[PDB]
Design a protein around this ligand. Structure first.
Ligand SMILES: O=C(Nc1ccccc1)c1ccccc1[SeH]
Ligand SMILES: O=C(Nc1ccccc1)c1ccccc1[SeH]
Ligand SMILES: [Zn+2]
Ligand SMILES: [Zn+2]
Lengths: 153, 153
């Protein structure tokens, strides 16, 4: 019943449209849409803390982390609320996105409305890279495109 | 205290940053920042319903209007929640924005988080233009720049 949407833009050629939908407050969020202009393979896919694009995607701050946990894959107990893991771009540079997540929400204290969705330069190592940056960002590199997560029709 | 922010971008040169601060729930909201690339004079300045940028500023929908009223100035009893009236571009094309509104909120029913701020091509006539368009849009014309209203540090 709660419908939200995010348009991903950055300096470069990466852009996309991601829909979010949640039927029950406590229940899962379906995340789906398309992203084009990516390099083929995995790209880190995260909700960042701030709906702030004042200095581009950098202003968005870290992965949304209300419970002060270390970075992980979406399936781990130890993760950021914003840890949606990876999306996969085909050879034409298009990632078809379809995720269900039960840690993000479109209501309550884990609500992601007014926060930033970011698609990253390279693979999220899901906290398994064996360095400090692995358990903070997943070493997914720079922020290619982002947008503020907003209420849709 | 809640702090939110909006970056205004469009197809032309209008660019700006607008901060929103509310110290207590259903308290007044301070709106302040800077917009540049505006023609000298009054520009309609409204929160629109949808934080949806899929089709540029057009997909923002109409003025945020949860109480199903007609368009007016921010000081009118008959207004949209999104009716913030006008901002003034000086002779350099810069609008230094500073508004206090008690109808918009950053919590509860009148909350503008995940909605869209739009600066318009022309003056908001505050519903006194003597036509249908006046009682819906204030004849503010086209959407020069918009942004989704997001959570700030
Ligand atoms: O809904 C929100 N909070 C909220 C907090 C506690 C209980 C119920 C609801 C919210 C606040 C800001 C932005 C977006 C949302 Se969804
Ligand atoms: O505030 C929100 N929910 C909410 C829930 C319970 C009490 C008060 C408020 C909210 C939801 C979506 C967007 C923005 C806000 Se501010
Ligand atoms: Zn993380
Ligand atoms: Zn209006």
């Amino acid at each position: 019943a709660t419908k939200v949407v995010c348009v991903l833009k950055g300096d470069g050629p990466v852009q996309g449209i991601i829909n979010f939908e949640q039927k029950e407050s406590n229940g899962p969020v379906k995340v789906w849409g398309s992203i084009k202009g990516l390099t083929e393979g995995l790209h880190g896919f995260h909700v960042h803390e701030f709906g702030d694009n004042t200095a581009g995607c950098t202003s968005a701050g870290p992965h949304f982390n209300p419970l002060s946990r270390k970075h992980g894959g979406p399936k781990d107990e130890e993760r950021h609320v914003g840890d949606l893991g990876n999306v996969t771009a085909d050879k034409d540079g298009v990632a078809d996105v379809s995720i269900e997540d039960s840690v993000i929400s479109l209501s309550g204290d884990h609500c992601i409305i007014g926060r930033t969705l970011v698609v990253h330069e390279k693979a999220d190592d899901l906290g398994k890279g064996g360095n400090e940056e692995s358990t903070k960002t997943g070493n997914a590199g720079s922020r290619l495109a982002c947008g503020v997560i907003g209420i849709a029709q």
